[PDB]
Amino acid sequence: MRIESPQNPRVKALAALKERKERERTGRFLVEGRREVERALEAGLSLETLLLGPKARPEDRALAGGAEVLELSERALARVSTRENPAQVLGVFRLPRRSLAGVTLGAAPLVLVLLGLEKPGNLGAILRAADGAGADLVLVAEGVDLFSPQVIRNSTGAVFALPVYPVAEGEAARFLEEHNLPLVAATPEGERLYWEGDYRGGVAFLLGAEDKGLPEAWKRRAQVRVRIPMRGRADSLNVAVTAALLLYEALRQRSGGAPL
Amino acid sequence: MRIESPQNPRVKALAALKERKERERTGRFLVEGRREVERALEAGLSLETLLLGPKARPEDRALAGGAEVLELSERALARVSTRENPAQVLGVFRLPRRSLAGVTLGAAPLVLVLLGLEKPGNLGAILRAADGAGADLVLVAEGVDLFSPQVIRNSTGAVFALPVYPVAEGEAARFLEEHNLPLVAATPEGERLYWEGDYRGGVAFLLGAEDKGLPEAWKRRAQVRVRIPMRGRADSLNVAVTAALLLYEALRQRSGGAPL
Numbered sequence: 001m002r003i004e005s006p007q008n009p010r011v012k013a014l015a016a017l018k019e020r021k022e023r024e025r026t027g028r029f030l031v032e033g034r035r036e037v038e039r040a041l042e043a044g045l046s047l048e049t050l051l052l053g054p055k056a057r058p059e060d061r062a063l064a065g066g067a068e069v070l071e072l073s074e075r076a077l078a079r080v081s082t083r084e085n086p087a088q089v090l091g092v093f094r095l096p097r098r099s100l101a102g103v104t105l106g107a108a109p110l111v112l113v114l115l116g117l118e119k120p121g122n123l124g125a126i127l128r129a130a131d132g133a134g135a136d137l138v139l140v141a142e143g144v145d146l147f148s149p150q151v152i153r154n155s156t157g158a159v160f161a162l163p164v165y166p167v168a169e170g171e172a173a174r175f176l177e178e179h180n181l182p183l184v185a186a187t188p189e190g191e192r193l194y195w196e197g198d199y200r201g202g203v204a205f206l207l208g209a210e211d212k213g214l215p216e217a218w219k220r221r222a223q224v225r226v227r228i229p230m231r232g233r234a235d236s237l238n239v240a241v242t243a244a245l246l247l248y249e250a251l252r253q254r255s256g257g258a259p260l
Numbered sequence: 261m262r263i264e265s266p267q268n269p270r271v272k273a274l275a276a277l278k279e280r281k282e283r284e285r286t287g288r289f290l291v292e293g294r295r296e297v298e299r300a301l302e303a304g305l306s307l308e309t310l311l312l313g314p315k316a317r318p319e320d321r322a323l324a325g326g327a328e329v330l331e332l333s334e335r336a337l338a339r340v341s342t343r344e345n346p347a348q349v350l351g352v353f354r355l356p357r358r359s360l361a362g363v364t365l366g367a368a369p370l371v372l373v374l375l376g377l378e379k380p381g382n383l384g385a386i387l388r389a390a391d392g393a394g395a396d397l398v399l400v401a402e403g404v405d406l407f408s409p410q411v412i413r414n415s416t417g418a419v420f421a422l423p424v425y426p427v428a429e430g431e432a433a434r435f436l437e438e439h440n441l442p443l444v445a446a447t448p449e450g451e452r453l454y455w456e457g458d459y460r461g462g463v464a465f466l467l468g469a470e471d472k473g474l475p476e477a478w479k480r481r482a483q484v485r486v487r488i489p490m491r492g493r494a495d496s497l498n499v500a501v502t503a504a505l506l507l508y509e510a511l512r513q514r515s516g517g518a519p520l
């Protein structure tokens with residue numbers, strides 16, 4: 001069917017999914033954007049309803065795969081959207097439960113441990129970097145929301161295929177301990193250059209969120225603390241840039257590059 | 261003195277510096293943030309007026325160094341600021357006159373050439389990365405505004421110390437030919453991995469602005485085209501992340517690292 005009024009109860013229900021509490025209550029979440037919807041589908045998430053705006057393309061209908069297709073008016077679409085200018089393709093997906101239970105890591109795994117709550121902008125950028133480098137696992141803080149409109153948007157949907165899990169620090173520590181993997185703490189005060197670390201057999205990088213920084217306890221127990229060199233006026237890099245540099249250095253060594 | 265009303269004439273004039281048009285007309289620009297003001301001062305920029313918010317520190321007054329010190333109400337500060345949460349220290353500086361003609365590079369220069377008009381946010385982030393890697397020079401497009409609040413904030417004020425020059429394509433080409441810089445074009449389809457380039461003897465990286473492509477004339481000219489591996493879903497990284505990866509790879513090789 002097609003819904004005209006932004007006051008229609010279905011539209012109100014869809015708009016309510018902007019809130020985390022409503023996503024948890026309903027077990028549903030909204031994915032906005034043609035690209036983001038394709039990414040969620042590819043990742044194996046279950047589509048319940050496809051939403052199409054007035055400027056949707058005929059190809060967008062093929063994304064439904066049997067799900068309900070709901071057409072929205074311009075005004076109805078604007079109510080449901082979290083964007084300045086709404087995407088013309090959106091999907092209502094089942095909110096999956098994520099858990100490290102039984103998760104196994106491949107050989108010489110590249111792991112990023114992001115300590116502390118992170119802002120959605122940074123978080124999206126970090127996930128994109130992890131996606132690019134082919135990280136085997138990303139651990140984030142226990143309360144991190146990976147299904148918010150902002151994280152989905154800022155990661156361009158990279159969040160969906162990535163092995164990323166919100167976990168308490170205690171659980172994370174115990175999980176990492178089970179593997180023969182070095183803990184490498186990133187910090188501008190690190191004693192070694194990050195190029196000097198040996199990541200050829202895998203690595204779990206420890207990286208603090210932007211405003212929290214690396215917790216002293218994690219810095220202490222790391223096998224090595226590494227810095228990215230700063231050669232100008234700035235005392236530190238953005239957290240996502242830091243994450244990319246670390247992951248791509250591990251990738252360089254996996255690709256045959258020698259530690260410095 | 262202390263100014264209370266956001267409608268005070270001084271406040272309106274200060275708030276008017278939010279437009280490039282008014283900055284050019286007055287030869288003045290606003291630098292917001294204690295850190296950014298200090299770094300502007302370090303760079304030798306001339307401070308005309310120090311602005312102090314109600315919650316400024318007594319230690320902030322020392323920044324004035326002979327300049328007029330104007331105190332603002334929370335109300336008045338909010339109108340001058342470009343932030344939701346205004347910094348309590350701001351500075352009105354004189355616009356400097358900068359020319360590429362008076363620039364000489366080191367023995368094995370690290371140069372970034374950013375082609376096309378770039379969003380102010382991305383630009384500041386690129387400059388922060390360039391400063392960290394210790395780039396000798398960054399060339400940007402002719403119309404690029406380096407004194408916008410966004411470039412200042414996202415560079416954490418590193419824009420002030422970093423050698424950055426807005427130049428037309430002809431002037432950039434002239435500079436590069438004259439300094440005999442090897443041109444390496446960064447593109448996702450590059451024939452070589454960016455680790456496979458030899459940057460030990462200096463390099464100018466050619467990088468297209470976000471969403472903008474890399475001009476075929478520049479791409480063709482380059483000695484080599486290199487890509488950053490993308491092992492996940494996405495096909496490209498954010499421009500500031502790309503810039504950081506390229507520049508720090510060059511720095512790795514300068515620091516004793518060999519090409520892949």
Ligand SMILES: Nc1ncnc2c1ncn2[C@@H]1O[C@H](CO)[C@@H](O)[C@H]1O
Pocket residue numbers: 186187188189190207208209210213214226227228229230235236237238239242
């Ligand atoms: N040059 C650097 N070396 C190592 N870690 C860094 C560097 N710059 C920023 N970080 C890290 O990035 C995050 C953002 O401040 C923090 O966890 C911080 O420790």
Ligand SMILES: Nc1ncnc2c1ncn2[C@@H]1O[C@H](CO)[C@@H](O)[C@H]1O
Pocket residue numbers: 446447448449450467468469470471472473474486487488489490495496497498499502
């Ligand atoms: N994987 C990559 N390799 C080389 N350049 C890239 C890569 N990803 C993005 N870029 C560049 O970064 C900018 C942002 O799209 C463009 O100049 C683009 O060419």
Ligand SMILES: [K+]
Pocket residue numbers: 024025026027
């Ligand atoms: K529920």
